[PDB]
Amino acid sequence: LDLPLDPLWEFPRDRLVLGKPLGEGGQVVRAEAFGMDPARPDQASTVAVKMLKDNASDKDLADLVSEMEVMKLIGRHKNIINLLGVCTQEGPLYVIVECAAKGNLREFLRARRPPGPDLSPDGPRSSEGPLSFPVLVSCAYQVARGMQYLESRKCIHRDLAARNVLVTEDNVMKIADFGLARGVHHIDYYKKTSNGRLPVKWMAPEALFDEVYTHQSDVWSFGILLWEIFTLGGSPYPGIPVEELFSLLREGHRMDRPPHCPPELYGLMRECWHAAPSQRPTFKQLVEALDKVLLAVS
Numbered sequence: 001l002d003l004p005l006d007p008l009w010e011f012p013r014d015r016l017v018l019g020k021p022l023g024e025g026g027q028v029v030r031a032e033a034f035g036m037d038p039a040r041p042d043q044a045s046t047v048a049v050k051m052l053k054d055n056a057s058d059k060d061l062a063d064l065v066s067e068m069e070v071m072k073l074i075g076r077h078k079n080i081i082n083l084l085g086v087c088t089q090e091g092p093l094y095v096i097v098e099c100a101a102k103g104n105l106r107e108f109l110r111a112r113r114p115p116g117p118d119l120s121p122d123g124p125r126s127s128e129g130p131l132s133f134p135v136l137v138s139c140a141y142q143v144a145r146g147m148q149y150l151e152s153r154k155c156i157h158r159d160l161a162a163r164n165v166l167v168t169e170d171n172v173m174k175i176a177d178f179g180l181a182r183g184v185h186h187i188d189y190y191k192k193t194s195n196g197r198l199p200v201k202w203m204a205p206e207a208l209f210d211e212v213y214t215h216q217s218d219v220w221s222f223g224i225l226l227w228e229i230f231t232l233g234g235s236p237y238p239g240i241p242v243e244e245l246f247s248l249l250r251e252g253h254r255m256d257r258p259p260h261c262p263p264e265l266y267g268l269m270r271e272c273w274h275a276a277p278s279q280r281p282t283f284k285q286l287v288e289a290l291d292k293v294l295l296a297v298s
């Protein structure tokens with residue numbers, strides 16, 4: 001290709017060993033990288049690599065270039081998936097990002113649900129599941145801090161959801177795909193994903209009905225994500241098909257308070273779903289409110 005060389009970010013492609021596919025449409029693969037830190041040139045790390053497939057158009061190339069450049073602009077934060085390097089010279093375009101070992105937050109939560117109540121005899125910690133209330137609040141706090149950072153860089157996510165938050169080996173939350181092209185003028189609202197998700201159920205009403213996105217549209221989505229956290233990966237608006245969702249949103253319907261969820265947290269959810277965007281909290285306010293809950297842990 002004739003892509004310009006950016007020495008700040010270029011990484012030698014022969015220091016990558018490509019491995020297992022992580023997603024395909026182009027594709028993302030898991031890889032081992034050697035010397036991502038130039039101070040440790042022989043040290044291995046595990047990364048995710050985005051690339052085009054042989055079919056790709058000039059438009060697909062421009063889209064991946066745009067995604068690479070937006071990640072350079074937005075800069076680094078602990079609670080987002082960060083750009084690590086690019087391979088633009090002498091070979092196919094690769095964009096290399098952090099790889100979160102524990103997968104996405106929806107699956108992380110669902111896999112850590114306590115078992116059913118009559119499966120096995122009681123034991124020393126049978127009343128404890130893996131996930132405690134302060135760790136659930138911390139997950140929410142970390143996503144709010146990531147979104148506050150992205151907002152400060154003028155980034156509207158437009159699909160914020162537990163499936164788009166990834167979990168590291170140390171249980172750090174990292175927002176995924178914040179610079180991904182989302183084709184907002186051609187959304188199939190009835191679309192169900194391969195894993196059963198109906199992404200329309202995370203859209204703020206002004207985005208769904210009026211095609212308007214602001215940072216306060218992402219606050220609505222954050223409220224849905226808070227509900228996913230405190231249902232340990234539940235699916236929003238259970239038992240409501242998309243046709244009925246349209247009708248219920250026009251009537252002001254909101255999800256019920258989940259079980260085992262304190263009123264402080266359902267309170268925050270309902271603030272995030274206030275009809276008027278200006279009457280929803282900001283991400284700065286959400287960070288502060290969740291910080292106070294964390295500091296009140298015994």
Ligand SMILES: */C=C\C(=O)Nc1cccc(C)c1Nc1cc(-c2cccnc2Nc2c(Cl)c(OC)cc(OC)c2Cl)ncn1
Nearest residue numbers: 022023028048050081095097098099100101103104176177
């Ligand atoms: C790190 C080891 C591993 O296998 N992790 C793993 C296994 C299963 C499932 C997941 C989610 C993960 N962790 C991931 C996955 C991805 C990923 C998966 C599919 C598509 N994209 C991405 N990452 C990605 C990419 Cl490649 C770009 O490219 C520009 C931008 C992104 O957001 C900014 C993201 Cl999230 N990524 C990290 N960990």
